[PDB]
Write a protein that binds this ligand. Structure first.
Ligand SMILES: [Mg+2]
Ligand SMILES: [Mg+2]
Lengths: 142, 56, 193, 99, 216, 136, 43
RNA sequence: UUGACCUCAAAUCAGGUAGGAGUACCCGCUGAACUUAAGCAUAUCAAUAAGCGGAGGAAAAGAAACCAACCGGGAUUGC
RNA sequence: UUGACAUUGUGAAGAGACAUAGAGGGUGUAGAAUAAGUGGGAGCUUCGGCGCCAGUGAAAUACCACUACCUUUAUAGUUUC
RNA sequence: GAAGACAUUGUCAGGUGGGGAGUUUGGCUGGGGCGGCACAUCUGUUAAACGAUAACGCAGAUGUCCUAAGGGGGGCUCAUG
């Protein structure tokens, strides 16, 4: 399956959750007892990985929250044209479906490709939507 | 005026802003803060052109 | 609730069923008053036989078409063949049903014969004069009983010619089952140029 | 349509000699009389057409009887009434073309 | 499938009738499928890309270059296919006019798994701009077999324009083979395409130096 | 239009299957309530029938036929003196007019097994428990 | 007390939610600043 | 000017009629929840109780826009 | 609160969208030229001329088609605003 | 006078709606709550040499992985010194 359930108390920091059908990454967790007799409630503060928005939800601790599958994958650039990166996989597979980043990451990547470094791109998959998060340079195998 | 969701706005101006003059119009949009949004949208267009110029 | 090896019961007593309980304590008294009503009706219609003449007629479904029974009234075609109008038959005591039809000649002939015997057996009084009193009977149904027709004779000769009466039934069922596909194949064979 | 004599099959049932009874007058209730035909023709001449009938006339003239029958099936209840309505409107088109 | 095999058979029949008998051409004529897709946006929708290998080759003689190592070049001597080594690529020294000349020289490129990393570093991104990027080959596989495979490759990639075209095959092949290849190419195209057989704008079959014929 | 359920502020105080307020429909017809108001206006008359004449978005318009059971032209004229029998007081209130029988469902057939001799009468008849002297 | 007002209740006297109320709110909810375009003391 | 017609009124005009009671049974409208489901929301209780309108010695229904598929039956009601 | 249908009739203009009938059109620089793109194409030729090798240019030129985007006329047209 | 086929009204359809309605808010447990899972399972032991056998007893494990890490055959012998 694309996504799998988990418990709120089983969740911990720097883990992925589904909040309002968005892949989110937790920055804050806090548990407070509801009433003296009652079970504690978990208040979760998380950041969407793709959009960067801050989303929070509180739930019972025993409640089950949905968790996405996030895969980070490593590729080499071939060209940046029309806002669409062209990447090259190990064993020689090529994809052009990735859109170029639109922020300061995209600006730095564009300048780095213009001045000619060999750039290593990390793109993540979660719940059927695809994006690029970071780039490095290959220190060896020039 | 033939793009989506514009006639819904145009009904309200006929409903409540028919009897108005431009001094009051500028005062109310400055007091409601939409003019700053229009300014920042045109500014974002300006850095959209400007970043291409700096790249060249 | 559920318990030892017992059948599953379905007793519909979850409403206020004790509000609707009819115990027929008045069976005997109701029978007595019913006989009283019959006797006072007979005294009121003192020559007439307390019930109309009903036709013999064939029972509807395949479970009951082997039997014959009493109908509501005679067909207008039956009373015209008997030779009297429907209004006159209704006045002299013959039940007439305007909405049943005659599709069976044996039933038609039986009802015409039954009307002929009724017209032979009754006495119709003049409307004005003497009234020659005639000691009523109380049941036209008992004076004209419904008789089941004799379908066959009890002894015959064996007429066997080799079809076994099972192959015949099976072939009839098969040709009914594969009727319409055969005319479909025949139609496409005919329109195949 | 005679019965076969056996209990199953196509014409199952007992063979009895038939009678073919006299036809009931209520079986001819929907039959059109001369006087009502004359009245219906005269009031059709007097009243003319309803708006959905006018737009059906345009649909046979432009978009054909298939779209005309689809619109008449949406407008009236059933496909049978739609077919009869499109047939009589086509008759009105032919008669007005003759006029 | 909206398109029917008998209609494909018919249109192939007048296509081969025009190409072979009535107006014969000296060069061998390739049969082309030109498609246009409908109600689709390159900017928002996912850019589909896919490839299939036809059983009988569309272009037997099209020029191919093999970038290769020592083993790959030694095998390429047996294959008879043009090759330049890693030392040759280093010679080239990222000069744009000569690599553009090479890109217009060779339609297809086949490269080794080892050297496919630094093919962009020696050559740059103008191969990705042209759309001719080298295909990986390994020591285990047969180079001439993969030359036949690449010569029989059919690739659909969206890009920016909403119309594509591929070469189904030659005029000179047999009619059933041409029908089967055009049918499997249309099926592959609609398999790559989302909401299949309804985002198909137009399908056109043509021969080289021939008129267009419209299949839906 | 519909019949709004007359409850204060829409609170029904029950299970959620009975929380509907707006889309509830009256079981009798507008023709029926029209002739019932006409009968209350002229209680000395007897309602015979009614027919539609006109409508708009707000109102439906009916014409009600009424017969005077005290007038001598209806006391005589044996075709119509059946309306003078006291069992025909407020036929429109008991649902004995044409639209009343239509709304009560009084028709022959297999489609009217619930409502053929009276819905409550049939319900009592098939919810009665019948016990005889010699128990069967 | 919370039975008597939206603002009632609590172990300290405080409003709880925001006091700016939507124009589309219903009777019994419109207690506070109804459809406020802005709040606070401007200078 | 006069005399009609249509429509709408007024009379302590001549003569009538309706209301209220009773309500076991009858014809309608409206309409729950307790309860059961070992919890509970559909369901059930129940097309019931409560509420409202209208009759009679019975009421209602009733002489097929019926049932059927048979060799066909033949208004309604009740067992 | 928003939309549709009905209540709901009577008149004029102006835009827009489809159907299918046909027309023309595309100029940063460089490059012989006005490069919308794609895909085929090494021979097509009507001139024995144009492409091809070669020049430049991201994109190359004949000879073919396709697809957008534009403007453009018309229908007893279909329609919406 | 104003307004005008727009409001209004009727019926559907989407949104909003603790203002209100109805209901729910596990179990084991050296009291309950927090904790844990002894709640479906597996290995060794407690376990008293057939079998069975408890505790919130002890030491651990499971919600997978594998087109071979399955099946057949052949050849060879491993850790360590
Ligand atoms: Mg109402
Ligand atoms: Mg408070």
């Amino acid at each position: 399956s694309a996504t799998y359930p988990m418990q709120c108390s089983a969740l911990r920091k720097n883990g992925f959750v589904v909040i309002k059908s968005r892949p989110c990454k937790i920055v804050d967790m806090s548990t407070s007892k509801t009433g003296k007799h009652g079970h504690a409630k978990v208040h979760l503060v998380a950041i969407d990985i793709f959009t960067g928005k801050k989303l929070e939800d509180l739930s019972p601790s025993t409640h089950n929250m949905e968790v996405p599958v996030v895969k980070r994958n490593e590729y080499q650039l071939l060209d940046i044209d029309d806002g669409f990166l062209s990447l090259m996989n190990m064993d020689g597979d090529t994809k052009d479906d990735v859109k170029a980043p639109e922020g300061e990451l995209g600006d730095s990547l564009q300048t780095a490709f213009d001045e000619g470094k060999d750039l290593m791109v990390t793109i993540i998959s979660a719940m059927g939507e695809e994006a690029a998060i970071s780039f490095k340079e290959a220190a060896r195998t020039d | 005026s033939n793009v989506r969701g514009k006639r819904g706005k145009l009904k309200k101006i006929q409903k409540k802003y028919a009897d108005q003059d431009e001094t009051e119009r500028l005062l109310r949009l400055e007091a409601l803060g939409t003019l700053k949004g229009i300014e920042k949208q045109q500014q974002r267009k300006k850095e959209e052109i400007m970043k291409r110029e700096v790249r060249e | 609730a559920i318990s030892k090896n017992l059948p599953i019961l379905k007793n519909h007593f979850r409403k206020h069923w004790q509000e609707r309980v009819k115990v027929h304590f008045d069976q005997a008294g109701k029978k007595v008053s019913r006989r009283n009503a019959r006797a006072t009706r007979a005294a009121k219609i003192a020559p007439r036989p307390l019930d109309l003449l009903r036709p013999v007629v064939r029972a509807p479904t395949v479970k009951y078409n082997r039997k014959v029974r009493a109908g509501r009234g005679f067909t207008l075609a039956e009373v015209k063949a008997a030779g009297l109008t429907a209004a006159y038959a209704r006045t002299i005591g013959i039940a007439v049903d305007h909405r049943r039809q005659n599709r069976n000649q044996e039933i038609f002939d039986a009802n015409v014969q039954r009307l002929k015997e009724y017209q032979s057996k009754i006495i119709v009084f003049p409307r004005n004069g003497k009234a020659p009193e005639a000691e009523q009977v109380l049941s036209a149904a008992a004076t004209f009983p419904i008789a089941q027709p004799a379908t066959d004779v009890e002894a015959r000769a064996v007429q066997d010619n080799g079809e076994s009466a099972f192959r015949t039934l099976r072939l009839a069922r098969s040709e009914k089952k594969f009727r319409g596909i055969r005319e479909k194949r025949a139609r496409e064979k005919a329109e195949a140029e | 349509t005679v019965k076969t004599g056996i209990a199953i099959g196509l014409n199952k049932g007992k063979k009895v000699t038939s009678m073919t009874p006299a036809p009931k007058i209520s079986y001819k209730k929907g039959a059109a009389s001369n006087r009502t035909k004359f009245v219906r023709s005269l009031v059709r001449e007097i009243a003319g057409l309803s708006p959905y009938e006018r737009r059906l006339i345009d649909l046979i003239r432009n978009s054909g009887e298939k779209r005309a029958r689809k619109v008449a099936k949406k407008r009236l209840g059933s496909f049978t009434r739609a077919k009869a309505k499109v047939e009589e409107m086509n008759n009105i088109i032919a008669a007005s073309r003759r006029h | 499938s909206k398109i029917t095999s008998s209609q494909v058979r018919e249109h192939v029949k007048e296509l081969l009738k025009y190409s072979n008998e009535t107006k014969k051409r000296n060069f061998l004529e390739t049969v082309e499928l030109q498609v246009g897709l409908k109600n689709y946006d390159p900017q928002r929708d996912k850019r589909f890309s896919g490839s299939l290998k036809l059983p009988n080759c569309p272009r037997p003689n099209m020029s191919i270059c093999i970038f290769g190592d020592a083993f790959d070049v030694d095998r390429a001597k047996s294959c008879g296919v043009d090759a330049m080594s890693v030392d040759d690529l280093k010679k080239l020294n990222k000069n744009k006019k000569l690599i553009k000349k090479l890109s217009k020289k060779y339609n297809a490129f086949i490269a080794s798994e080892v050297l496919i990393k630094q093919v962009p570093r020696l050559l740059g991104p103008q191969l990705s701009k042209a759309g001719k990027f080298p295909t990986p080959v390994s020591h285990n596989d047969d180079l001439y077999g993969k030359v036949t495979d690449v010569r029989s490759t059919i690739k659909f990639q969206l890009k920016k324009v909403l119309c594509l075209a591929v070469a189904v095959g030659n005029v000179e092949m047999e009619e059933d083979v041409l029908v089967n290849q055009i049918l499997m190419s249309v099926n592959f195209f609609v398999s790559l395409l989302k909401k299949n057989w309804q985002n198909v704008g137009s399908l056109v079959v043509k021969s080289s130096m021939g008129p267009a014929f419209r299949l839906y | 239009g519909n019949r709004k359920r007359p409850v204060p502020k829409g609170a029904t105080y029950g299970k959620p299957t009975n929380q509907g307020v707006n889309e509830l429909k009256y079981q009798r017809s507008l023709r029926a309530t029209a002739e019932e108001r006409v009968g209350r206006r002229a209680a000395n008359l007897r309602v015979l029938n009614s027919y539609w004449v006109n409508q708009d978005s707000t109102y439906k318009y009916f014409e009600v036929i009424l017969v005077d059971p005290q007038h001598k032209a209806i006391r005589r004229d044996a075709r119509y003196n059946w309306i003078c029998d006291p069992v025909h007081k407020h036929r429109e209130a008991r649902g004995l007019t044409a639209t009343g029988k239509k709304s009560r469902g009084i028709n022959k057939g297999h489609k009217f097994n619930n409502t053929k001799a009276g819905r409550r009468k049939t319900w009592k008849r098939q919810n009665t428990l019948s016990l005889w002297r010699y128990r069967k | 007390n919370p039975v008597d007002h939206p603002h009632g209740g609590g172990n300290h006297q405080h409003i709880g939610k925001a006091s700016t109320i939507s124009r589309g709110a219903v009777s019994g909810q419109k207690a506070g600043l109804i459809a406020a375009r802005r709040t606070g003391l401007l200078r």
